[PDB]
Amino acid sequence: SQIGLFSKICRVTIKTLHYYNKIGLLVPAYINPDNGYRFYTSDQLMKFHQIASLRQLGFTITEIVTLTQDENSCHIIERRRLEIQKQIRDMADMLSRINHYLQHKKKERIMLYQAALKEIPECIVYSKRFIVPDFSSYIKLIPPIGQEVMKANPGLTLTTPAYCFTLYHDKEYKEKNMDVEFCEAVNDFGKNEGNIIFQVIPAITAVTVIHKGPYDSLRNAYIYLMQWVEDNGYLLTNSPRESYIDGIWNKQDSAEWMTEIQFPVEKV
Amino acid sequence: SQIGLFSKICRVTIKTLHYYNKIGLLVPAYINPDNGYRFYTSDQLMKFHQIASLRQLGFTITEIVTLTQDENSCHIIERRRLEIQKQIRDMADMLSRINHYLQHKKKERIMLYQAALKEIPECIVYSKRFIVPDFSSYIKLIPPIGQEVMKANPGLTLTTPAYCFTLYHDKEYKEKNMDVEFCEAVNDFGKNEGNIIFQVIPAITAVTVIHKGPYDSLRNAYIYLMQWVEDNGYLLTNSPRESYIDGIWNKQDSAEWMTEIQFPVEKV
Ligand code: 118
Ligand code: 118
Predict the structure, then answer these.
(1) Which of A2, A75, A262, B63 gives B59 a disulfide partner, CB atoms 3.0 to 4.6 angstroms apart?
(2) Which of A11, A91, A117 sits opposite B84 (nearest CB)?
(3) Where is B204: in which H helix or E strand?
């Protein structure tokens, strides 16, 4: 039968048959060489049935071409079986995050905090860990650590980009008497002097939020993320990090300082 | 900051930044007039965080653009929540159906039937209802059924292609008796007489397989489909159909005949 009628019996378009004949799939029965027409037989219906059945299961064209001729090979099906489960879990997570987005946006008219997942690699740092009574004494006592360590460690170069952060080792969020550690990243090791130490922090996967403005409201950021981990069925696994990007060392308007809070979490 | 350092602050490729500048999504702070170099600032990172945050919910570039610059436009988010809720369902069928596939393939290491879902539009048919004692007698009795109808009507033109079939109105099969109907599709209505009548048959969505060979193995097809609609969670809403494509009237070898088995189903 000619191609315009075969396309109505099969209920598909003609461009589909042209494309199939081009790629080497469902080659016609008899092509007339003078005019160039294509004539199909009832033998082609029983292969198109198989093509449409395999395509309705999500397979791509090259696997179907490799399948109809290498019929012993059946592991492509499992290769697809793992990707389907991955797709179900990702769509089931995007759905929950969209619902959380709408639930959060219900009462608040606009939103400040926008969470995002990311990867953080391994690093070498020099660090110092101690207890502080408050945050203001902390802000003033950091820079002595920076002048002093360069005094005792000659020629120590930082990394690119710069990574300078602090760890809140306490299990519960507090306002005074905080156990805190300060870390800055360098390229190579050195030797310890007094309380200043050198160590290696492993690689993590973390959820991040960026806060912009004055320090006093940073707890608000810590509110949102503390909601986030509970709302979308996640579990906080390790101590949070607070890494400093823009502060008093580059600018004078303290209402333009920007920092980023990262909670290492896992989908369990 | 130059493009190569900013690409390491954000952990993204350079071609992505070029593309985002071309689209109009993320425009650099300052561009050199003669070189053409691109320089970025911290607020570019605050915005890239928002871009990635929006991109993690599955939106495409145009909606992300429309979301960032324009008004809130909440109707786009819930409208997405349907495209996910639907998609999961779609996904949730296929992981089932492929799981059907394996439970049959690994039983025989050969596949005789492959099922596929399709849609059959509405038609105008002539039809005759009756009870049959034995299928062979029905085959023998069909040529007179053709003869009465062929003589007494002017301008009785069949369809292109030819759709002639038999309707099985029984719920649970038995070899003793069968309430069947013979149907052949025509273009227009007219007057009815005798045991034959004209009627319209509405469109349906059916699962079909194609059987080639004699009829004395046809039950082996049904036992397959009676499983396929039961395991993978679909529901049989109406009487099956048996459509005849190629037989003694076009061919000579009965082992090269070809028929099509159709089960009308819905998603339940
Ligand atoms: C060791 C200890 C502190 C700093 Sb810094 C800083 C500098 C550049 C970029 C990011 C951070 C600092 C502040 C004032 C004067 C000199 C250095 C610093 C201080 C307090 C809180 C966060 C960072 C550096 C090394
Ligand atoms: C009225 C009733 C049945 C048939 Sb046919 C047939 C005709 C066209 C296309 C396909 C089938 C038939 C049988 C023998 C010789 C010539 C025509 C027919 C026979 C058995 C089963 C189904 C249809 C024809 C007219």
Answers:
(1) B63
(2) A91
(3) strand B204-212
